[PDB]
Enzyme design. Structure first.
Site, short mmCIF file in Angstrom:
data_model
loop_
_atom_site.label_atom_id
_atom_site.label_comp_id
_atom_site.label_asym_id
_atom_site.label_seq_id
_atom_site.Cartn_x
_atom_site.Cartn_y
_atom_site.Cartn_z
N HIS A 12 109.13 36.48 22.23
CA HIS A 12 109.06 36.33 20.88
C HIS A 12 108.62 37.66 20.12
O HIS A 12 108.52 37.55 18.90
CB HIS A 12 107.96 35.42 20.49
CG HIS A 12 107.79 34.27 21.46
ND1 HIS A 12 108.16 33.01 21.15
CD2 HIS A 12 107.05 34.10 22.56
CE1 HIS A 12 107.59 31.91 22.12
NE2 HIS A 12 107.14 32.79 22.88
N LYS A 41 117.20 27.66 26.14
CA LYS A 41 115.91 27.39 25.62
C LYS A 41 116.12 26.84 24.49
O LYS A 41 116.96 27.26 23.66
CB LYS A 41 115.09 28.60 25.38
CG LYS A 41 113.66 28.40 24.97
CD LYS A 41 112.69 29.66 24.74
CE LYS A 41 111.38 29.17 24.49
NZ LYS A 41 110.55 30.49 24.23
N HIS A 119 101.26 32.77 23.37
CA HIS A 119 102.35 31.65 23.29
C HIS A 119 102.38 31.61 21.80
O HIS A 119 101.49 31.29 21.00
CB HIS A 119 101.72 30.22 23.84
CG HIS A 119 102.25 29.08 23.28
ND1 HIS A 119 103.57 28.53 23.39
CD2 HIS A 119 101.68 28.14 22.74
CE1 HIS A 119 103.84 27.62 23.01
NE2 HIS A 119 102.53 27.11 22.36
N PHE A 120 103.56 31.28 21.51
CA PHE A 120 103.94 31.05 19.88
C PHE A 120 103.98 29.65 19.61
O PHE A 120 104.54 28.75 20.25
CB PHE A 120 105.38 31.54 19.45
CG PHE A 120 105.77 31.58 18.06
CD1 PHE A 120 106.19 30.26 17.76
CD2 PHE A 120 105.42 32.47 17.22
CE1 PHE A 120 106.47 30.06 16.36
CE2 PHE A 120 105.76 32.25 15.96
CZ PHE A 120 106.23 31.14 15.55
N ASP A 121 103.16 29.11 18.73
CA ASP A 121 102.79 27.68 18.61
C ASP A 121 103.54 27.08 17.42
O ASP A 121 104.24 26.37 17.47
CB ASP A 121 101.24 27.50 18.35
CG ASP A 121 100.88 25.90 18.71
OD1 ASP A 121 101.25 25.57 20.02
OD2 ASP A 121 100.40 25.33 17.94
#
Lengths: 124, 456
Positions: A12, A41, A119-121
Site C-alpha cells: 500500500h 486482488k 493493514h490498511f482498513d
C-alpha cells in the site's frame, strides 16, 4: 520472510507520485506489487504521503476497526490516496482496475513495538 | 530463448549484456522497463538482424513517437518474420502512426497487434487502416482499447472489414464511438467475409438501438464464442432486441459479458428463455446490473431446466439480499452443471450465507467455486462456513475477502481446514486483518497441508 510490516510497505505505499498520474495507474501498480499474481486482488489503496508521515498514525487517534478490534489508529490529515478497484471485465488472469484518486483520512492497524502499521482498513 | 525483463528499471549494463541476445531471442517482452527512445535504437538494429523472433512486446514504455518509429524500422527487413507485436501504452500518438502502412505491407506474417492505450485519435486509426487493407496484410486479432477513437474511426474500419476475411478477434472497448459509429461499424461487420470468435465493445456508448443491428451478427456468426458488451446502457429493451439472434440455431456463443448494462428483472426474463434453449452458453457476467432478489428468483428457475448447461455465473453487485438465498440454495442442491458463483458485493449477510452452507453441505453438490466476497459476513458467519467446509466435498475455492471477519472467524475456518477430510484448495481472504497468533497458526496449517493455499 516478508514481515507483515513489509507486506504493508509493498501492498500500500507509493511515496513517489503525490497523486495518481492517469486513469491507467492501478493496472500497473497491482501488477508491479504482485497483487494480481495468483489471482486479482479485489481492491487495494495506495497512499501518497511519505512513510514517516504514515508510520506516525500509530500514536494518533485510536479507533475500532471494521471487525471490532481496537488497534486501529486513524490519521488526522486528509492524505492523498488512490482507490484501485477491479472492473467488470477482470476475468483472471486478465485483471483490470478503475482508478479513482482522492484525499481522505486513512484508518490503519498497528501491531507490536516499534508500533508500525500492518493493514490498511478504510478512508473517511 | 525468451527475454522477459518486466517491471525492472534496466541498468545500462544489463541492456548492453542483453543487446546481442536480442538477435537470438524468439520472444522478447520488455514490459515496463526503463525503456525509451535510446533503447529503441538498439532494439531496432537488433530487430533487423534476428531471423527467429516471433513476438515483440514493448509494453508500458515511454518509447514515444520517435522511439517507436525506429523499433518499427527494425521489423522492416525481410529477415523479420514476427507474428505478434504489442506496443500497449507506448505513448504513440497519431503522429508516429505514419509508418504503420509501410510496416504492415512488409509483414504478411504479423497476425496479432495491440495498440491500446495509445492516443491514436481517429487520425492514427486512419493510417492504421491503410495498412490493414493491403492484400499483403492478414491480421487476425486487433486490439484498439482506450485509443481516443471517436466515431470518425468507424467508417475506415467498417472499410477494413468489408475487405478482410482474416480477422478472428476485434476489441475496440473504451472509445467513445456512440450509437452512430457502431452502426457504421455494425453495418460493415455485416457485409464482411470473416468469422470472428471474439468481439469486445466495453464502455463504447451503445444504446438499445445498436442491439437491433447486433442481432444479425450474433445470429449469423457461427465462429463467435465471446461477445463482451459490458458498460453500455442497453437496458432491458436492448436485451429483448438482442435475443432473437442468440436463439439463432447457428450461434454458439460461449461467453456473454453483460455487466453494467442497465438490465433489471424484466431483461432476465428475456435471457432465461435463452439459458433454457441454449446448451451452448457456458460463461455469463451480469455484475453491476440491479437485478434484485426477483432477478435472482428468475435465473434460478432456468438453472433447474436440466437442458441448461451453464457453468460460470457472475452476479457481483446485483442488488441481491438475503431474500434470494432461499432460492439460490435450492438451485445449488439440484443443479448438476453450474461450477462457479460470484455473489460478491451483495448484502447477503450472515443469514444468507448459512442457507448456502446448508444447501451446499448436502450430498452430491457440485459448485466448485463460491465467491462470497464482500457480502457482510462476520465472525459469527464463519461458523456456518466452518460446518460447511466439513460436510461439503465439492468446493475447491471459497473467496471471502472484504468481509467483517477477524480472528475468531479465521480460527473457526482453520478448525475445519486443519481437519483431515477437508477438500478445499484455496481460501481467498484478501484485505482481512488478523494477528501474529493467528498468522502463526496459518503459517503453521500452511505447513501441515501445503497443497492448500490461503491467499491475502
Amino acid at each position: 520472510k516478508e514481515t507483515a510490516a513489509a507486506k504493508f510497505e509493498r501492498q500500500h505505499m507509493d511515496s513517489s507520485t503525490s497523486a495518481a498520474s492517469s486513469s491507467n495507474y492501478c493496472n500497473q501498480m497491482m501488477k508491479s506489487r504482485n497483487l494480481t499474481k495468483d489471482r486479482c486482488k479485489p481492491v487495494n489503496t495506495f497512499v501518497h504521503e511519505s512513510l514517516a508521515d504514515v508510520q506516525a498514525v500509530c500514536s494518533q487517534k485510536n479507533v475500532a476497526c471494521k471487525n471490532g478490534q481496537t488497534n486501529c489508529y486513524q490519521s488526522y490529515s486528509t492524505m492523498s490516496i488512490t482507490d484501485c478497484r477491479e472492473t467488470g471485465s477482470s476475468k483472471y488472469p486478465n485483471c483490470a482496475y478503475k482508478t479513482t484518486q482522492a484525499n481522505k483520512h486513512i484508518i490503519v492497524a498497528c501491531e507490536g513495538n516499534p508500533y508500525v502499521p500492518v493493514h490498511f482498513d478504510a478512508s473517511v | 530463448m525468451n527475454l522477459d525483463i518486466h517491471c525492472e528499471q534496466l541498468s545500462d549494463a544489463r541492456w548492453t549484456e542483453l543487446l546481442p541476445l536480442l538477435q537470438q531471442y524468439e520472444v522478447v517482452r520488455l514490459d515496463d522497463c526503463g525503456l525509451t527512445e535510446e533503447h529503441c535504437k538498439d532494439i531496432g538494429s537488433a530487430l533487423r538482424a534476428n531471423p527467429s523472433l516471433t513476438e515483440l512486446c514493448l509494453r508500458t514504455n515511454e518509447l514515444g513517437d520517435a522511439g517507436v518509429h525506429l523499433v518499427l524500422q527494425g521489423l522492416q527487413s525481410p529477415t523479420c518474420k514476427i507474428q505478434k507485436l504489442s506496443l500497449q501504452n507506448c505513448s504513440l500518438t497519431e503522429a508516429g502512426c505514419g509508418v504503420l502502412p509501410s510496416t504492415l505491407r512488409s509483414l504478411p506474417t504479423l497476425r496479432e497487434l495491440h495498440l491500446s492505450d495509445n492516443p491514436l485519435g481517429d487520425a492514427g486509426l486512419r493510417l492504421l487502416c491503410e495498412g490493414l487493407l493491403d492484400p499483403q496484410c492478414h491480421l487476425e486479432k486487433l486490439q484498439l482499447e482506450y485509443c481516443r477513437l471517436t466515431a470518425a474511426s468507424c467508417e475506415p474500419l467498417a472499410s477494413v472489414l468489408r475487405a478482410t476475411r482474416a480477422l478472428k478477434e476485434l476489441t475496440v472497448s473504451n472509445n467513445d464511438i456512440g450509437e452512430a459509429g457502431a452502426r457504421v461499424l455494425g453495418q460493415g461487420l455485416a457485409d464482411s467475409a470473416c468469422q470472428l470468435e471474439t468481439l469486445r465493445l466495453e464502455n463504447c456508448g451503445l444504446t438499445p438501438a445498436n442491439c437491433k443491428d447486433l442481432c444479425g451478427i450474433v445470429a449469423s456468426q457461427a465462429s463467435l464464442r465471446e461477445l463482451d458488451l459490458g458498460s453500455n446502457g442497453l437496458g432491458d429493451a436492448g436485451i429483448a432486441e438482442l435475443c432473437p439472434g442468440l436463439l439463432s440455431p447457428a450461434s454458439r456463443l460461449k461467453t456473454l459479458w453483460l455487466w453494467e448494462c442497465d438490465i433489471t428483472a424484466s431483461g432476465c426474463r428475456d435471457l432465461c428463455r435463452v439459458l433454457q434453449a441454449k446448451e451452448t452458453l457456458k460463461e455469463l457476467s451480469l455484475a453491476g446490473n440491479k437485478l434484485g432478489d426477483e432477478g435472482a428468483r428468475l435465473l434460478c428457475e432456468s438453472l433447474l431446466q436440466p437442458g441448461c448447461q451453464l457453468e460460470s455465473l457472475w452476479v457481483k453487485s446485483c442488488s441481491l439480499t438475503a431474500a434470494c438465498c432461499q432460492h439460490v440454495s435450492l438451485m445449488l442442491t439440484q443443479n448438476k452443471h453450474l461450477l462457479e458463483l460470484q455473489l460478491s458485493s451483495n448484502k447477503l449477510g450472515d443469514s444468507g450465507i448459512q442457507e448456502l452452507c446448508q444447501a451446499l453441505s448436502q450430498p452430491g453438490t457440485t459448485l466448485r467455486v463460491l465467491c462470497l466476497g464482500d457480502c457482510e459476513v462476520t465472525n459469527s458467519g464463519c461458523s456456518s462456513l466452518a460446518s460447511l467446509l466439513l460436510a461439503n466435498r465439492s468446493l475447491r475455492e471459497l473467496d471471502l475477502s472484504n468481509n467483517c471477519v477477524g480472528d475468531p472467524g479465521v480460527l473457526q475456518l482453520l478448525g475445519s481446514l486443519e481437519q483431515p477430510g477437508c477438500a478445499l484448495e484455496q481460501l481467498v481472504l484478501y484485505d482481512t486483518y488478523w494477528t501474529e497468533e493467528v498468522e502463526d497458526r496459518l503459517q503453521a496449517l500452511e505447513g501441515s497441508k501445503p497443497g492448500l493455499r490461503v491467499i491475502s
